[PDB]
From TrEMBL, chain A:
Name of this chain's protein: CprB
One MF term in the entry's GO annotations: DNA binding
Organismal lineage: Bacteria, Bacillati, Actinomycetota, Actinomycetes, Kitasatosporales
InterPro entries listed in its UniProt record: ArpA-like (IPR047923), CprB_TetR_C (IPR054126), DNA-bd_HTH_TetR-type_CS (IPR023772), Homeodomain-like_sf (IPR009057), HTH_TetR (IPR001647), Tet_transcr_reg_TetR-rel_C_sf (IPR036271)
Source superkingdom: Bacteria
PANTHER family to which the protein is assigned, alphabetical: HTH-TYPE TRANSCRIPTIONAL REGULATOR LMRA (PTHR47506:SF3), TRANSCRIPTIONAL REGULATORY PROTEIN (PTHR47506)
Gene name tied to this protein: cprB
Keywords associated with the record: DNA-binding, Transcription, Transcription regulation
PROSITE patterns in the cross-refs: HTH_TETR_1, HTH_TETR_2
The organism of origin for this protein: Streptomyces coelicolor
Length: 199, 203
């Protein structure tokens, strides 16, 4: 029962290698040598490479869900929640390889275990917040929210998949000018600039 | 010319699989079976996965540039081109597969797809700026990224993540948003009706 504390070290080590060098080419022996443990310590937590991949995707998904639920309980407008969620994820992503690895696993097409695809989950979240925002009169009624959610999810996720706070603020500036009624506009431009400054 | 049809068929099957499942976890044996050919037939035309990837990148780059060459205000040209690209993404996996390949770190040489797409777009947007169709204060990089991301959506990491054929819809929506935000009020109307029109002529 000191073997239990090594799990997060192994995950971190795997996350770091998957992120930088990719899933396919990283071996269990590399991960174990990077983490400084035995092959037994790894097998104690993970039978195979795919289990580390699943573990990292689990975390990325929980993290997503927790941040989204928390930001929906703070009395914010639905559009402010969505905007804080994008900046909130980006902040966690530069702060830890586990989400970066999670994103790299998705780009490379490592199957997600039947857990939904992270990109489909994020599109659902954005879609639901965009519909709430339309109902709250913060986004024009004639806006196709589904199409925006797809674009947002692909955009937010970054050009590696095809500095962060600044980039994310420019994408929001564009969306705000184009889909937010002119009188609701300044508040959200101000918020975007504020979140960039804060992160 | 049946050997050359075989090559094209192998290329098409690899692109379809890459688009649907990714480059890394797709094997040569899956591609041989999906192409209907023998293992010996595949190795006759390609030594390795990476040669199939190079062939795909070479095709998508040729196709893109052909559309660009066939062209209007700079803004209208850029808008016609995106719609032309969306149309390719509707009919085949080559362009998407091209992204999967770039994301996987396949070496190119020739530029990577997103690098070229951002150049063409930024260059057309900057010309739109001097033509007064676009405000000068736009961040062109973000605009270029926005346009690309409207076309692929979540399919950027899996062709099955979304049903094909909605590329034109998403792209048109993202032009409406862009136009509202960056085209001067005296000129918006013409570009809004042009975006709605290209969508009908495309989709």
């Amino acid at each position: 029962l000191r073997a239990e504390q090594t799990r997060a070290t192994i995950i971190g080590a795997a996350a770091d290698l998957f992120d930088r060098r990719g899933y396919e080419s990283t071996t269990l022996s590399e991960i174990v040598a990077h983490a400084g443990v035995t092959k037994g310590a790894l097998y104690f937590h993970f039978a195979a490479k795919e289990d580390l991949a699943h573990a990292i995707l689990e975390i990325q998904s929980r993290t997503s869900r927790r941040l989204a639920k928390d930001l929906d309980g703070r009395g914010y407008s639905s559009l402010e929640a969505l905007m804080r969620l994008t900046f909130g994820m980006a902040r966690l992503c530069v702060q830890g390889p586990v989400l970066r690895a999670g994103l790299r696993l998705a780009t490379a097409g490592v199957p997600v275990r039947p857990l939904p695809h992270p990109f489909t989950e994020w599109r659902e979240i954005a879609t639901s917040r965009l519909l709430d925002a339309v109902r709250q009169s913060d986004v024009h009624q004639d806006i196709d929210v589904d199409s925006v959610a797809h674009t947002l999810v692909c955009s937010v996720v970054g050009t590696r998949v095809v500095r962060e706070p600044r980039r994310l603020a420019e994408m929001w500036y564009i969306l705000i000018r184009g889909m937010v009624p002119v009188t609701r506009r300044a508040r959200y431009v101000t918020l975007a600039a504020r979140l960039e400054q804060e992160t």
